[PDB]
């Protein structure tokens with residue numbers, strides 16, 4: 640069963656980029672949101688071992704210290720194909736009618752068992768929800784984790800950025816600007832990197848797919864003292880006007896970033912948008 644799994648190395652999402660299998664279908668109560676908003680969260684990956692980003696264990700996120708509803712509620716129904724994984728796909732921050740599924744501490748939906756048959760479920764999402772304005776110290780610590788060894792160039796960059804930009808939002812903007820101005824390539828056939836994979840990507844090849852960009856950005860943020868994690872899921876979808884629903888295929892698999900700061904809580908950012916805005920605005924198969 641092709642699909643997202645609990646870990647990924649840069650390159651692994653590109654392999655899904657090459658699959659046209661169906662992942663899920665979605666029908667909205669009202670108008671389809673703009674494509675730029677169609678970030679379908681599956682899970683977060685908080686552990687980086689120098690090669691792969693991976694899911695950590697979670698606890699409950701269904702409480703008011705965790706998050707606060709604000710802004711518009713988007714209501715939609717989903718039919719998911721079997722994933723053989725226990726994650727329901729939904730726009731952040733999601734609530735469902737599934738009594739065996741819980742919103743976890745990292746704002747992903749964890750089902751008690753993996754989805755091994757087609758599954759219909761109903762969702763409400765609050766994309767403007769405030770997330771963890773006060774962060775659990777364990778969550779903070781976990782999201783500053785890096786290997787001690789490896790990727791010295793990226794650590795040097797993070798140091799330089801931290802010294803130049805006191806405010807997290809400014810540092811994040813400066814990092815996004817590097818992707819925007821430098822000759823980065825967005826490709827389904829990224830060049831191989833060596834052991835210092837983040838350095839090789841940022842400073843040598845400047846070529847990758849979404850996991851390269853998301854993983855490298857999360858690395859640099861953590862090295863600069865900004866808690867950050869990779870978000871994995873899907874972005875976009877294909878409209879079926881005969882049936883009035885969106886299809887989301889495996890080629891729509893995507894990875895992005897969220898980072899934390901006091902008061903504002905977690906904010907999501909997508910470095911891919913700096914290099915391949917058409918991917919976001921048009922969809923991968925209209926771009927690549």
Ligand SMILES: [Cl-]
Nearest residue numbers: 650652653850
């Ligand atoms: Cl990838």
